[PDB]
Amino acid sequence: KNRAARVRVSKGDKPVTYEEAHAPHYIAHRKGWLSLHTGNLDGEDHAAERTVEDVFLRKFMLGTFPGCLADQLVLKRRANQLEICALVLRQLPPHKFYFLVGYSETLLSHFYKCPVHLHLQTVPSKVVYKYI
Template identity: 35%
Template sequence: MASLLGRLYQARPVQQFRLVQHCSNRFVHQKNLRSGVPKTTIKRMVKLSYETAQFPHQIGVTKSWNSWHTSNLHEEEGASAAALEDEMIRRFLQGIWGNKLLSECIIKRQFNAITLVFTVREIGKLKEVNFLTGFTEELFSHIFKRPVNIEVQVCSSTFQEVFKWI
């Protein structure tokens, strides 16, 4: 009889341990989210903008998506075409603006219009920024056969873009 009671007392903590072990498995999955997090350096020499300083699991909370469109809704057509156009826009921008781009390009699609928002380094003369903006708008409007608007923010120094040093 004593051994039977001992087995009952032993069975109860085992069930509780399984519950704790089950809960700890959830925390293990949350703990290992390190794929998009930049590593800190000893002398804190790496600059991070606000977008790159946010953790990947905070997209939609403190960080927004880089492409805004409704093609991903249920039974909407054109999701793959929008993703292909977004990649093409980003590559063209990198080719046209070169090392003057300081931030990632945010692409907003509203009705038939495309709006591009990004930050550039000050080039010297404002005429060059205006020329590149107009050239890019005309090029994308001709390629995509829809109106393209560009909103450019010009930073005079790269320290205005720095959110924190790691």
Template identity: 40%
Template sequence: MNKSQSGRYKITNKRSRPLTYEMAKPPYEIAHKKSWNSWNTSNIINGNRPMECAVEDLFIRKFLTGTWCTLFLSEIIIKRNHNMIRIAGIVKKSYDPIKYYFLIGYTEELLSYYLHCPVKLELQSAMNEDIIFKYI
């Protein structure tokens, strides 16, 4: 078991590869030191719509990746609370705030229309260097 390499990053000679907090934690520490990227309670016994939630999460990630192109610096976190979907992440601080406000409104409106429930984006902006956790 200790020889498994899945989900781990190889150390470079000069330790020049930057890692974010999400990437720096090994897979076996998920749920102990790092949380899940999707939060929903539909996968419990007799939960409603477990497959639909997984497909919706995939759709949300693809939609945000296409709409926000290269602006997301971190993983996209999806949290479901009752009938509301909250999407969190860190975006690049490179455009005017007016463009971000437009993209936030556009994304919330379209996702609310497609998913038939209110969608709220909770974004923070940062520079590229701000999210580097360590170098390996």
């Protein structure tokens, strides 16, 4: 049985988001990719250079926003500047949210030698698509 990127069905009470509710064979059919760049095109290069940065960004943001992250990041790469879209639960005060976003928008830019934009959408709770 296929088990990659597949959340198993419990007795009928587990809340699952839209991204988790779809198997990997539904990519580009019902759900889109979590990241967009040019390294995965036909006549383009520098794919692993962007891939390692994507993985580092995923882990760094997961550690930076502990427990308040709703879904996975959306990493857009558009003309030397990278945008990070995140869905965050409204657990932290806005004073602490702004401190973290200001710290990140400078640390990531100085670490990757490229401008970084960070956008957060505050949700009251995790949005459930399928049974809960």
